[PDB]
Design a protein around this ligand. Sequence first.
Ligand SMILES: Nc1ncnc2c1ncn2[C@@H]1O[C@H](COP(=O)(O)OP(=O)(O)OP(=O)(O)O)[C@@H](O)[C@H]1O
Ligand SMILES: Nc1ncnc2c1ncn2[C@@H]1O[C@H](COP(=O)(O)OP(=O)(O)OP(=O)(O)O)[C@@H](O)[C@H]1O
Ligand SMILES: Nc1ncnc2c1ncn2[C@@H]1O[C@H](COP(=O)(O)OP(=O)(O)O)[C@@H](O)[C@H]1O
Ligand SMILES: [Mg+2]
Ligand SMILES: [Mg+2]
Ligand SMILES: [Mg+2]
Lengths: 469, 468, 339, 394, 46
Amino acid sequence: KTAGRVVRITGPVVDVEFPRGSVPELFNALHAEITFGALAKTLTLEVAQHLGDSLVRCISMQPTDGLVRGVEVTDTGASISVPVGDGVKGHVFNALGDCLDDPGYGKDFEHWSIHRKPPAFSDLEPRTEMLETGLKVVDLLTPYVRGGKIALFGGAGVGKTVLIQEMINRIARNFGGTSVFAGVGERTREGNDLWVELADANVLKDTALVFGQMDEPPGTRMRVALSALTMAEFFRDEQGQDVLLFIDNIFRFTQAGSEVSTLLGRMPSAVGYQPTLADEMGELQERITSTRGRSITSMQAVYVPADDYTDPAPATTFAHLDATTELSRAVFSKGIFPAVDPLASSSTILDPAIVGDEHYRVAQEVIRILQRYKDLQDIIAILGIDELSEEDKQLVNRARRIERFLSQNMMAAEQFTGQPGSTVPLKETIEAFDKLTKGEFDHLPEQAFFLIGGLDDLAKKAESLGAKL
Amino acid sequence: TAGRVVRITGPVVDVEFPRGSVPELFNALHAEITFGALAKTLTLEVAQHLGDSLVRCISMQPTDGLVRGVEVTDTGASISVPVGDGVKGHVFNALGDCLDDPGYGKDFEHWSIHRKPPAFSDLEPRTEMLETGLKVVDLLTPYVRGGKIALFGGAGVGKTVLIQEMINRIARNFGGTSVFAGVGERTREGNDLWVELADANVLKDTALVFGQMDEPPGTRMRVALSALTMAEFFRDEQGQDVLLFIDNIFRFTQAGSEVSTLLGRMPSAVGYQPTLADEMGELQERITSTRGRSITSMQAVYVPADDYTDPAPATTFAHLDATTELSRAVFSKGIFPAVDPLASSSTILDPAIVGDEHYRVAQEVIRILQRYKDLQDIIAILGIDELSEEDKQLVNRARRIERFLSQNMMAAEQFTGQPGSTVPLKETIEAFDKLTKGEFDHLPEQAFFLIGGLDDLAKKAESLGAKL
Amino acid sequence: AQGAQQIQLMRQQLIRQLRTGLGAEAVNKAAEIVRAHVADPQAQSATVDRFLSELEQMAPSSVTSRLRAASRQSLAALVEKFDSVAGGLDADGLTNLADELASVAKLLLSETALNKHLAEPTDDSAPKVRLLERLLSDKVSATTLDLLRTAVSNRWSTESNLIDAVEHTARLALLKRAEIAGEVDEVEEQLFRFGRVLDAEPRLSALLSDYTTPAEGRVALLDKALTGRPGVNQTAAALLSQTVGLLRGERADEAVIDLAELAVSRRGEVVAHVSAAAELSDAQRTRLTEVLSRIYGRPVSVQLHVDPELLGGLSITVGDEVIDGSIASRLAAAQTGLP
Amino acid sequence: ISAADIEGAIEDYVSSFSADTEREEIGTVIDAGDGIAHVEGLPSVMTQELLEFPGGVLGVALNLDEHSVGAVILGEFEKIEEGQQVKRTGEVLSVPVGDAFLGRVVNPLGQPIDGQGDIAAETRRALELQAPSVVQRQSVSEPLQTGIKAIDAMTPIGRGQRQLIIGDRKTGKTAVCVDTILNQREAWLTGDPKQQVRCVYVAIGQKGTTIASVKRALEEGGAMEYTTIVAAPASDAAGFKWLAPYTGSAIGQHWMYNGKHVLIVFDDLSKQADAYRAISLLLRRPPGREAFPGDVFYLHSRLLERCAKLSDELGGGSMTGLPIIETKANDISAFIPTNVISITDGQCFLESDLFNQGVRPAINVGVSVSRVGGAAQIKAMKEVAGSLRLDLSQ
Amino acid sequence: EVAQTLTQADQQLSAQGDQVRSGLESSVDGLSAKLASRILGVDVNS
Ligand SMILES: Nc1ncnc2c1ncn2[C@@H]1O[C@H](COP(=O)(O)OP(=O)(O)OP(=O)(O)O)[C@@H](O)[C@H]1O
Ligand SMILES: Nc1ncnc2c1ncn2[C@@H]1O[C@H](COP(=O)(O)OP(=O)(O)OP(=O)(O)O)[C@@H](O)[C@H]1O
Ligand SMILES: Nc1ncnc2c1ncn2[C@@H]1O[C@H](COP(=O)(O)OP(=O)(O)O)[C@@H](O)[C@H]1O
Ligand SMILES: [Mg+2]
Ligand SMILES: [Mg+2]
Ligand SMILES: [Mg+2]
């Protein structure tokens, strides 16, 4: 016939020999069969390289345990495809398009290949419409962009997932469009929690969930993002419906790529990463984008290994974003939630042209005060605050109050603390931080500013402490 | 008898020759690039005998457009450059081609650029101070006539400006011959030096050899050897005093490391070739004065990423008689020349050669600067008021001393508009003795910034309201 | 001014869209008319004749390869020695020589150490000749011993080159006996046909292209499947059988193609593969042979691979150079050549 | 809108259509993947020759050995398969060049990507023509005003100079370069080519919408009339990212050698270095520090040495370079930043700390320098800003 | 006013382009026939 046979197996990577003239194209899906009892299954191999001599190196989506050399391998003749349409909403899928909450569902749907080129450059248009979230720190210092790309960077356990949940609550809840969530190499129980929460909040009927989680082979963990992005692309390009795309975690896509590259025999780059790290990341990211008249607001949680922000993965990820919230271990240690580093975070739309002159002025004054406090940390760690000048002492008190007031009781934090969250209008945020920067609340105790919403909450908490606003 | 190209990989070309016609190591071979846009004649240098009648060679020119299987011709000798008095006043490339007058010097005597260093029995240590008129150099890093001088520093700290200043101060009145070797530096800088030497009328005594950073690794590896071959001819044959300026000698090592792995060599630490020290010694041991034949060599040494512990500068250190080490910290303070007084050194800075007064004043300056360096962080954190009276006095003296070590350099006018100054050694010693004794503590430290001798100090102090 | 520039750009863009649409429709209609006009076989013949004329209007080309210079020279010496030796040999003698040489080649392949020792280049070959004589002076005939001593006396870059040279000499003997018989064209045609059928059945070649199994078994498989047929030429059969028997990690189809190339090269010609949409006429074949020989100087044999997708003209590949006169190439160029 | 023009053009093309046959040297793909291919054959291919793959795909021959040719696919490598036929083009890698490239956005091969039709190329220029020699240049003497006081006074940039803009992400590097491009609007409006500056903005590994934002900013300020963008977005293959600066340099060099003054911005060379490292690793060349190839310094040295100030004998044209480098955690000691700092004629070093303090542009005065100095300033600026940088350092 | 002029011109040019396209529909046959003549190397009447 024309089927190949397995010749080499090195974990997830498989070498397959085909008859001449039947070598499958790159990224084609191939099917092999594992027949051993407990592990019996059908393997989907994605062609990754042509090795010559009619050999192809392929990445397996399922574990290859139990696979035998010489077993027949059949070429599907196309790449991995996933179901698309309004039918995907409300259902949970895996990287290959199989429905998990209801097996067999979506087999009759239109199927789109998970590999496609990004939009033509001529169709790209910069997006600068502010997306108001109701979080003080985000709205003030890192205003999110509607139809733009937002990222949440952070080491282990600084609050990336909780912030993703917060943004799902604040944005996807009262959203007229569709939402796509892509769990990429994260906790499976987190996927179950998200499923149940979306069902409870009635947002699930408008959301499509695709999960390739930690206990998956690197091939699945590097293709699940493509699958979810394909569903989002269908919603963007075929139904003209505003799309929300939450991804957690994209660094796991990079990590799976690194593992595959190691298995594929590629010569490692710096820090052991794949040589094609930036290229793979760009190929993925340029697909996540709004086009003229077609909006995708994407929000990606990016894991920072060992709290190292100079690691190649996040370092290359930084360039693909319109807004970048950076969660810091130190801020988290102080108890400030969300543990945003206001000096390392940024937004392309935080300029006087877009957000107005007063918003920009207040943000810049807050940043200046916090930068001066950061500079003075060296003195303060040794001698405390009392060796500073009167100007610097006043600035330090103001800065401590400001950094506490950037924290907020989040909606998604209720499950942890039992305290309901708060929403602060942008105008109130600007007014409040203008008052802070001018020293109108210097008399209030610091804890009065901790985990509250607007100025009314500030007054109530200050009164409960003992100071009157 | 001709060979043929077998493998091309960047600047490294493998060539197969008929058995019995394999060229000797370091022989120059010729290949043709016939493509119209890049038509040229490549000079390859045999680097290795791979066996089976194959040789690995380093191209002196870009290999773009080279084809497999093209004829390769063996010249039978190494790269050779013209020597004689005709080189003076002209610009050459690494291969001996005249740039400002193509075809010039083809009839001169040609010397191979590969040569053993002088016999050890002909080596005589040089202990004779070469005055420059720069306060910091003359006081703390006195240069040696016929000795080896280096200017160490990171990128953009003043090495090239200092080399130009020393060309102005030393070579202009020099009675002998000067050789400048641009090694992997900016072509614009080479043009500026050419024009400046022409303007000063120093060019007629100077031979310029350029291989710039846009050239392939082979040219940057062999340009220093070419210039040194010309200088060696002037030393051994013509029997005249030679000035040799090299900028930048680190580029020789860097070019060596660029092709090291393509030659099949396992990397050493910090990504350098295993034969770092050997190649550096082969090149440097030729840069020397012999008994009765003088070469005063001055080399700019780039320190990668300001790291003085990097293998290349660390290896280079041992080959020098005097070293002026420029610092990024001094540079960023605004002191110029950005010399690091505590790190620079000179083998003739001892009482026997420079005399008791000079040595004592230099040592006292070094002690004051070391103490100030120790107290700097204390001052930064706890403030200066918490020092003792002696420490406060020392800090004032040290700040004035560090400012006074700066000087308005002749070659720095384009960067400041201020004409340069020259301070005689006696005046430098006297002024720094006075500074260490505290006789100028009544003047603002700003009075000591970028001035010449004591008269300039008095004038600037007057302009600032102080009196000297 | 910005508004005026935008208006002008819009005008230019509209002109561009109209031009692109017009050109696309025109070129599609051109493709349709071309595919309709090429249907007539007379049209095919006319296109072929025009391409032939283009060839006669073309200037001549300026112009075992895997062997190194040393091994190539050694093999040249070996082949000229064989040519001198074979003058007196007869058909049965040549067959015995080929069988003995193939046996010696398989002996060397099986016995790696002896071939290794026998392959190291040395200034004096007397020890090697003594080793051969002590080994197989009586086992093989005088001519085989002379050829083997010549082969060892020369220089081989790598040990496998010696086995390659011995196999080359065996094939040389088989082709020489074929030439003496007078079936040179028949054996060439049969070898090319075997190459074609192996190419059609890649799996058969892959099964035959493994030396992990005994040689006799695969030779028997070849005999049963392809070689053992009523019309197969005896010399081609023996040549292919020995080649498959001596296979060392090469595909049977590639080996057969190499065998055909060697068989044609013995006459001094070069094989050129010509793809056409329709079978050429005998006058067309003669004209093509003449013009290709003129272009490449030495005469060339022509192999035809009819393929309707060419839509006339010819695609001639030879010596790693392709002249693509196929009308399909012209249509593709016109499609992609639009402004 | 004249239809007769449309017909005329189509008829002219069809008449000009001559798909005449010719002899071509071929090869065969033996293995491909990750944007690299290996080709058997091509006995006469020359180093860094453009190769044609089926389907309109282009590659470049980098490794030439006795067996095969290791080639880098310049875009759309997913269609490359074993056994495909590869053609020679008989010419080293080169791009079209001409005045028509002004106002356009092209990829590293010069093909338009703004969807505005073909570009009329005056001629073609090879990408590896060597830089002017020591004798072919003249000293930098003409200012290139950026409109930014902190730069024009303290680190002046002259025509024919390479000034490095180096700093952490979001420190204002692109802002400085785009402001410099926009500042040449008056010089362009003069109409005097001795004063006009033609700008080339090379975007390497940048997000597509970011390049669109840059183009929009240039449009609004009128700069797009005298500016060309060579775009190699993040989605592109490593070949384009590696090749884009050389394409922009060739386009600028065509104007420079014809008496025009050019300003080229490389945004940024860090991503070009990463793309070159990826290509070299995929070709399995021996890596060096941080996995970069041994000749990564040469990659940028030969690129930035083409930015020169030609002598009067060559027309007096110039090309000013503004390479951009991104540092991580303010580490100018990293390999690529140190490489580039040692190439350019000074640097403007931008700080997040200074930026947050309100010092914008965030020039670190102590560390930033211009190696041309007063020669790149007018007499009045020299007189007033004689020692400003030194005073600020003190 | 720039936007108003732009939309007016867009409509006017769209109408002009549509009607010129309709007018030139005819010549496509001759264009294709003559291009095919060029491709085949011999004039094709069709
Ligand atoms: N807003 C918040 N209020 C209170 N506690 C919080 C908040 N955000 C995070 N936490 C605490 O931090 C823990 C980690 O949060 P989260 O899972 O969102 O972090 P992460 O950055 O996604 O972590 P990981 O690297 O493990 O995926 C939460 O379980 C909770 O204990
Ligand atoms: N002089 C300035 N004054 C105020 N804001 C500025 C100034 N220059 C730049 N900015 C703002 O700083 C932010 C970063 O600017 P820019 O995009 O030029 O930086 P960059 O270093 O190129 O960034 P990236 O890492 O995204 O490439 C943008 O919001 C820009 O508007
Ligand atoms: N004596 C000086 N006075 C003022 N500026 C100087 C002086 N020396 C160097 N500089 C500044 O530092 C820059 C770097 O000097 P240069 O020697 O060219 O670099 P490098 O040290 O890398 O060779 C100069 O371009 C100049 O602007
Ligand atoms: Mg998480
Ligand atoms: Mg220098
Ligand atoms: Mg930027």
